[PDB]
Amino acid sequence: GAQSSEQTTLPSGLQIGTGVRPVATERLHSQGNLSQTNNSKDVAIKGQGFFQ
């Protein structure tokens, strides 16, 4: 309703709302640590980029 400002009054309306649907599943793309495997054919990446 209308707040007259004559009295301190509560702004009472009514809206209920619903639900908490999941909106996204973000992928936190940070540089992981490195682990030495001593294998010659194995390789890791510093910085961004993906093997195709």
Next chain:
Amino acid sequence: LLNIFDIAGSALAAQSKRLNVAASNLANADSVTGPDGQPYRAKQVVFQVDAAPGQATGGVKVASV
């Protein structure tokens, strides 16, 4: 309205008004505000013996909530 019918009907009306006030109280417990914005003051009814002229008894009136 027949006399004893008047007595008992007044009783019915008074008890009904008492119950309505009690229902309003029980429903408006935990009510932050009124319309203009003021506490909801709990309400009670006042019972008085009816038939001011004659016999000093007979019926109940619930004037002045």
